[PDB]
């Protein structure tokens, strides 16, 4: 049915932005620091049925850390996030992993290097090796471009359900049913974001 997922990593690495993208489809440009933790349910439809992740999106800023490792209690899986444009965030990966596995001794964990859409990459592909001895899955991702955005959830689902051929599927779409002026005019006259994007 459902699994507790903890999401950890340095402040500003894109944890919340990544979750939001999955929740609503949106890309939040602003950086509003998470305070302690935010819990969101997130459901995926698979060939093996629905899987629900209760996502505990934790604060990466030390000053907003709240219960810190207290959030990890009974997690069944995890994502460790860093930012490929910020070397300090990769340097801190072993610290996050240390704190996490001290509480969660045998869970599937994905390591994600976020923000690969940014041209000036700083954490070189070749350098990313921490996951190997720790048996973490690794993916380059971008919450902004959606590059590999589904990969961490697909992998975790396969591990959790115990089926390596599990796939996301389209669920059948139910037949839909059969001041306006002012609200529309406001929407018409607020520019769409990123008009230089391919889509």
């Amino acid at each position: 049915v459902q699994f507790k997922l903890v999401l950890v990593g340095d402040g500003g690495t894109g944890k919340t932005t990544f979750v939001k993208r999955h929740l609503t489809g949106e890309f939040e440009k602003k950086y509003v620091a998470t305070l302690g933790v935010e819990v969101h349910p997130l459901v995926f439809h698979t060939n093996r049925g629905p899987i629900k992740f209760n996502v505990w999106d934790t604060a990466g800023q030390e000053k907003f850390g709240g219960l810190r490792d207290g959030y990890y209690i009974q997690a069944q899986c995890a994502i460790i996030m860093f930012d490929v444009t910020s070397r300090v965030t990769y340097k801190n990966v072993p610290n996050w992993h240390r704190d996490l596995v001290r509480v969660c001794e045998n869970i599937p964990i994905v390591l994600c290097g976020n923000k690969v859409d940014i041209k000036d990459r700083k954490v070189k592909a070749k350098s990313i090796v921490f996951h190997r001895k720790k048996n973490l899955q690794y993916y380059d991702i971008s919450a902004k471009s959606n590059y590999n955005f589904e990969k961490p959830f697909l992998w975790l689902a396969r591990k959790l359900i115990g089926d390596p051929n599990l796939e996301f599927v389209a669920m059948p779409a139910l037949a839909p049913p059969e001041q306006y002026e002012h609200d529309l005019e406001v929407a018409q006259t607020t520019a769409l974001p990123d008009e230089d994007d391919d889509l």
């Binding site: 819990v39 709240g66 207290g70 209690i73 910020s86 070397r87 690969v116 471009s145 390596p164």
Partner: protein, 1014 residues
Amino acid sequence: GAMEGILDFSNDLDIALLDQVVSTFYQGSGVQQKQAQEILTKFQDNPDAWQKADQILQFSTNPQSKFIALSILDKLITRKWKLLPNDHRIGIRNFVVGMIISMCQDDEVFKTQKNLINKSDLTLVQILKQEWPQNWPEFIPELIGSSSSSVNVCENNMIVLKLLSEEVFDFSAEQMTQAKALHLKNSMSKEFEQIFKLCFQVLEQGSSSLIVATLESLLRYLHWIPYRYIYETNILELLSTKFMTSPDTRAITLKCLTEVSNLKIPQDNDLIKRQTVLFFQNTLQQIATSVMPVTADLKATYANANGNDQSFLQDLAMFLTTYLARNRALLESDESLRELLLNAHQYLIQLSKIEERELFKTTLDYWHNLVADLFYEPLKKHIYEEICSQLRLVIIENMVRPEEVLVVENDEGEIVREFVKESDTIQLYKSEREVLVYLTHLNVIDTEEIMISKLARQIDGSEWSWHNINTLSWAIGSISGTMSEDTEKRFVVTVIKDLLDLCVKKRGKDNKAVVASDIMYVVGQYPRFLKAHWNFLRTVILKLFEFMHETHEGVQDMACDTFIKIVQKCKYHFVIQQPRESEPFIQTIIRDIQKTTADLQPQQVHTFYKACGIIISEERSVAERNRLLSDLMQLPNMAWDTIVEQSTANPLLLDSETVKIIANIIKTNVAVCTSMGADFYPQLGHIYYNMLQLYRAVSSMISAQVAAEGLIATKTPKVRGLRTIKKEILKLVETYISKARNLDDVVKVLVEPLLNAVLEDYMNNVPDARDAEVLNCMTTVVEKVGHMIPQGVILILQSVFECTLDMINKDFTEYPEHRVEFYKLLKVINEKSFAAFLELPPAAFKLFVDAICWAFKHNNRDVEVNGLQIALDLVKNIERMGNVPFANEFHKNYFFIFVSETFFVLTDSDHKSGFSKQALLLMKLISLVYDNKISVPLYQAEVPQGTSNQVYLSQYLANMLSNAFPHLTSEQIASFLSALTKQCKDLVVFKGTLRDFLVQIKEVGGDPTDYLFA
């Protein structure tokens, strides 16, 4: 509500209510969970909450409540331990120790509350970090003794010891001063003989959960212990035999053995070499007999993902690669060891067939290590000839799609243009290519035979698939350079004959797309061949031109990329007149450029034009080259001329079609300028005057639009289109100037009209209408000719400095491009034309200092780094002036501003990325005073007259730190500053001292003698 009651410390703690709040948080959902979370965080953060810890541990029925109690204690121990009265310290130690003992002796608790016991153990370790051994000398002997009284206690003691080793050896560098880390490492080292004794005895006397815990501890010890503990005892036999047999112990044993393989070990000792061979031999024998034979299909096993098979196969890969990279020479000379060597490598071959990208990278790294060694070390390659032959097959069959191959199969089985770049396979391709290149050199006959026969089975249809032709084609392309020119010739001819057959035989847009992409990849990969076979090269190019009319957008785009890829390498053959041709091929291309590019998108047209510029720059005779350039630019120059008439008569608002035409003309110029560089000048000069006039006209259009429609006008397709014209004009000028060789013309002809056209327009537009590209263009201008235009640089500063600063000094995020370009501009001005800043009025020079410090405070690396560099360069610029009034006043006004601002970002924990450059700057500043390089007093009789700046500096800093960090003792501050000032000529030591200060400010009672570390 009810839950907030635990926050009222004036009343007794209702433990039941606490357990309800905790349960609501962990087991609840929605608003109630959210409220409960905030309450617990507030409770946790209460600086007296630790006083409740004992009560919670005693009375709670909720293990998560007790975890939280322990987190509360952890925070107290790590940050405020030495603030506590001595009886609170003794009491806390007693109840943590007691809780642990109590939980271990109850089998039910020990079995079911592992998380809580691990948390308790970690909390005990935090107390050890503070108290041990100086105020707890018998901890280890008593731990060892207590281990005999209970299997539970003994197992838990192994957990405690594992955590201590980690905290001391693996995670101390960031968390402890250099001196304290040394103390704890020395202390653990001195008692390790007895820790090991206990470890080895448990391991000898075989309880599985206890054994696993002991082995987990051993894994940590292996990070630092001397090798004699491993080689002078019987522990290697146990690890490589006994503990490999049971699956529960096998996982950890294998990781231990991997670390054993990394021990520091004498190189000249035959007995030790024998031992290193023996454990490997033992381990491989266990794998073969107890896990799987070398023939086993590990690909299949991994894909099944039963139990812990995936992690085990990963750890096996790590073990084999680690050992063999270090030790395979031990196995290479002795005939009796050959079978082991090859079986080990055969397992690796099997592991390399697993479908798991990251695991493949690990094994590929090993193969690279091997083949690079075989390439050089005499008499070795023959040993591995069969391994290498199998490896050739593996790599060829798993070649990732090259960056150049733009077509991919969609989920519906259609061959389509990729939506985006596969950015995460770039490194993978390079690594695969690297290994395959070595393998080709090692046996060119085998490689050719493999490729030519695989290709033959695509053609005859026996093995045909998109996947198969693709991996093969990519492989064939990737080995370009390995064969002799002569051997390559025959090989390429054979491959192309076959691929052309395949192209005739496999029809439909999908097949045609796949095969076209593969042939384009291959031909683009063999320029040496193209250069030697003009008739073939000409035929390839004409075929590419055909594809420029393809309705398949992926093929079409790839044709353009391949054209330029080929031209970049073969351009010389396009500029000469080839035997049996009437004209150089460049003439043929240019003559028919309208037809060839008719179906291309504008950006593809620009690429085509860019490729033509590459060719034309091969012509070194100026007359002939300028003629070719003129011919190339004929179409855009004719379109330009007609637009310059339609502007000359008007100016009114350009329609969107005209705006697009103009943008594309300029983009075409940019493209050609990019490849021709300094050679582009005659074309630039041809359009320049009218181009700057057009810049002004479009500028007035933009302004008029913002005036009539509001700021929202800047979002419209029309205004965005007009700004594109301005941006491309700026890009064209920047591109040219960045490559110009005639700087006299740049200054005399280009600069004055540019500045006249761009500067006032930037200054006098509203913020949202200002192009950051103006700043970028000016940076190149200053970089290339700044030394020659001192008044020009002044004008640039006057025009953009204050107004841009005001855009970016309200927060860290608005106008991100302006922000980044702004600081690049100031950097180059400070570097090349410092006199420009000397000329500023004092009020403006103050804004400059403010701007630099503002840069410091960014977390944005693109701003922070430049800010620090400017600060450093500025200090050097001032110092270079010597004892003159400007420098004296500079120091009087700003020395302490730079010192304190630098200290601030060093110490606030929000600018850790800039540590190295902050330290550098601080060291420079301190060394200025330490070297008496500041001529005037930095103080005003605020101190005795004649007081040295050294003395005043210490006083200022001690006061500054005393007020900013009141929890530090005066001696801590005094000792820190003494060390720091003494060390201002030795950056590595100076930084160590800064790092020690950063540790000490996070706690109370840090030892001042720590700053004596050396």
